[PDB]
Write a protein that binds this ligand. Sequence first.
Ligand SMILES: C[C@]12C[C@H](O)[C@H]3[C@@H](CCC4=CC(=O)CC[C@@]43C)[C@@H]1CC[C@@H]2C(=O)CO
Lengths: 253, 12
Amino acid sequence: RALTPSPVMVLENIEPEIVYAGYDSSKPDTAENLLSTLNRLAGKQMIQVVKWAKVLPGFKNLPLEDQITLIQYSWMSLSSFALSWRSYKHTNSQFLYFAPDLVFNEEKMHQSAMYELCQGMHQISLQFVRLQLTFEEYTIMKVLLLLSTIPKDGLKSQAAFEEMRTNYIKELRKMVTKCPNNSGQSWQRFYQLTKLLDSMHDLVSDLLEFCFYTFRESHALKVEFPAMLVEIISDQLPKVESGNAKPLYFHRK
Amino acid sequence: QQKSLLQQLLTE
Ligand SMILES: C[C@]12C[C@H](O)[C@H]3[C@@H](CCC4=CC(=O)CC[C@@]43C)[C@@H]1CC[C@@H]2C(=O)CO
């Protein structure tokens, strides 16, 4: 025998690769152009996200309806978390790396008409640097975000979901023991990481509020949304605004 | 149902 491999290696394998925004820095940085570009970018990342989720250990066994529900509830969280990861790995969290050809500095944050939201997402990137987050921890946390919110009345296969989520939590516990050592700095790190996952709920709440607004006012604001997002948001918005969503917390729940 | 990008991608 040798080691007892975890899905971690598998997760690293299915990890989607960078997608370009197709942005041209020479044209005007209007809010219309920036947000429309960002929404089209999201559409492309989303295809990768679904492809990624489809082969996830455990998640792949959930019924189609629960997989769709989970993805529609967590897409913003996944997108934002991945943004902070890229910002961390590519710029040491000095900028918001939406894509290799679309990196936001303070100036673009103001022109996007999303300044405060960009700051919130940036703060997560800052945490990644303060903790020197590892790719291993990151991939498991991504899965945990996918499993971070369910319907108020639970899923179709709730019990199976709870077992899968528990396993991924234990998995994170395994990883948090790796990177460091010194029992102390593992008990502590696991706490900080799960506390960070919880903070994603508040951030996503603000992100979604702005998202639903621009979606509703899409025509008057001239903010385009790709078919991929139109479908997801059209389904997600009604549920979220009616209080059907139930965020799962690790702490202060 | 018919179509739905999410459904397609998950069963492609
Ligand atoms: C959805 C928004 C545009 C775009 O979609 C962003 C999203 C924030 C998270 C995110 C990270 C990415 O790497 C690409 C796209 C994207 C997923 C943004 C929050 C509000 C903003 C808008 O509401 C513009 O209409």
